[PDB]
Amino acid sequence: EADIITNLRCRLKEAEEERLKAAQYGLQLVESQNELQNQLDKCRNEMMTMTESYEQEKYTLQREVELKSRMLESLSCECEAIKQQQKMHLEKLEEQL
Amino acid sequence: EADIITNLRCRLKEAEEERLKAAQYGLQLVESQNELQNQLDKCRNEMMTMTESYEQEKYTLQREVELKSRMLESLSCECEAIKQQQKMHLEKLEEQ
């Protein structure tokens, strides 16, 4: 009956250490799970930040293009006109002579 | 000492149950690790694709601006030259 106790004490030791491994491993896993979560939250944040940053640069570049295109159109239409003016002169001068 | 035994039995029973529960949590955490782990990868992939597809749109637009700019600097010149050739003519004609 005291040989019962030494088996049980030996057994408790074993079990109390096993539980600790099992407990330690779980804690290691939780820390991983959380560092994974706090970096997924971080990923989602920098995604939104990026998107708005990109969409601003885009809009401002699309503005430049539109204006530059307006300018170019006007100027090209001017050059052509004021070159035609010069053509008309040539024509007239040659006709006259 | 069915007083000490009583307790020691219940103590083992506890450690046994508490190790299994931990074991159970471990499974769940691994499952929910892989799951998390995948959403992280998804996010990270979506980021890369967006970044690439945005820095390319950037390129095309800057190229446009550069080209258009060169062109307009050119026939900003031309236009301002020819307009002088007219003016100059005109004053010669005024002289005559």
Author numbering:
A (entry chain B): 2 to 98
B (entry chain A): 2 to 97
Publication text:
Here, we addressed the organization and regulation of Spindly, a farnesylated mitotic regulator of DD (605 residues in humans). In early mitosis, Spindly promotes recruitment of DD to kinetochores, the structures that connect chromosomes to spindle microtubules. This function of Spindly is enabled by the 800-kD hexameric ROD–Zwilch–ZW10 (RZZ) cargo complex, to which Spindly binds directly through its farnesylated C-terminal region.
We then determined the crystal structure of human Spindly1–100 (only residues 2–97 were clearly resolved in the electron density), a fragment containing both the CC1 box and the HBS1. Indeed, Spindly and BICD2 interact with the LIC with similar affinity. The ≈23 nm CC1a coiled-coil, partly captured in our crystal structure, is predicted to encompass the majority of the long axis of the Spindly dimer (≈28 nm), in good agreement with values derived from 2D class averages of negatively stained Spindly samples and small-angle x-ray scattering experiments for both SpindlyFL and Spindly1–440.
